[PDB]
């Protein structure tokens, strides 16, 4: 299989290794109590939280706040990319990280246990629009104060980042959708179609990507609950028949077809290559 190296980033179970829709693939102890927290190694492009008044607002210190960190001194959240690089200008192992990894490491730098070295590290959202890193004080992603994770037009520049986001995600994680390409399975020297797919109608690539995300790996219904990256993470979008062909086994090659755009739950809902 000549596709092995190229198709490695689409082995979401191996490169991401956790839930996508709801990421709670690890546990951390904060002073005698275990908590669930995100642990996906890949960034989730376009993911945000919909509150049934926006989740990037700071946590309430009334009764209706958001998911983000409360105001701090010095203000470490929200913090711009340049603000972060300046903050870590003496740390050569951090100051030159890509914006997503840096945001992840910045969030993971904040220890809640002020008297001991705990392993709890907050998730984060990087907004490409403002170039701002938002540390999420609340790691919860769905509760149905009801809320749910989703891909949305409002969220297209958001990126959901766990503590485990690898510094080489650009090389090993998906981002762009593959235009004129179709996910397939390599068999006997030929790339065959995915034998069984679940067809969901979708008006455009965005809605297909949204659907895949809704059906993808989830660490919370509606260990034990951990998906470990297993799920309906991939989708072949036929732009002509407007079919989002969704499946749950990893693809191992590409098929040239001008009618198709290959997408994943981790991928950006718009960007193509």
């Amino acid at each position: 299989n000549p596709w092995t190296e190229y198709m490695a980033k689409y082995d979401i179970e191996e490169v991401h290794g956790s839930g996508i829709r709801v990421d709670l693939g690890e546990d951390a102890e904060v002073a005698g109590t275990q908590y669930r927290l995100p642990s996906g190694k890949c960034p989730v492009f376009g993911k945000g939280i919909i509150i049934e008044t926006t989740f990037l607002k700071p946590v309430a210190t009334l009764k209706d706040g958001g998911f983000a960190f409360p105001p701090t001194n010095p203000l470490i959240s929200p913090m711009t990319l340049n603000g972060m690089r300046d903050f870590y200008k003496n740390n050569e192992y951090v100051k030159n990280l890509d914006e997503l990894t840096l945001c992840s490491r910045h969030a993971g730098n904040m220890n809640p246990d002020n008297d001991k070295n705990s392993n709890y590290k907050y998730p984060a959202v990087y907004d490409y629009n403002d170039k701002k890193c938002h540390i999420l004080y609340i790691a919860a992603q769905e509760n149905n104060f009801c809320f749910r994770p989703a891909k949305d037009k409002l969220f297209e520049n958001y990126t959901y980042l766990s503590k485990n986001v690898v510094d080489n995600w650009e090389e090993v994680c998906p981002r762009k959708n593959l235009e004129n390409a179709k996910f397939g399975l390599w068999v006997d020297g030929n790339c065959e179609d995915i034998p069984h797919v679940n067809e969901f109608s979708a008006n455009d690539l965005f809605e297909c990507n949204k659907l895949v995300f809704e059906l993808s790996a989830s660490d919370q219904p509606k260990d034990r609950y951990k998906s470990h990256g297993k799920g309906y993470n991939w989708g072949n979008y036929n732009r002509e028949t407007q079919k989002c062909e969704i499946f749950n086994v990893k693809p191992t090659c590409l098929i040239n077809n001008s009618s198709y755009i290959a997408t994943t739950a981790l991928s950006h809902p718009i960007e193509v290559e």
Partner: peptide, 13 residues
């Protein structure tokens, strides 16, 4: 309040 993990450590409230 939080404590930074990377050096040098500080309290951020």
């Amino acid at each position: 309040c939080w404590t930074t993990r990377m050096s040098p450590p500080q309290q951020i409230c």
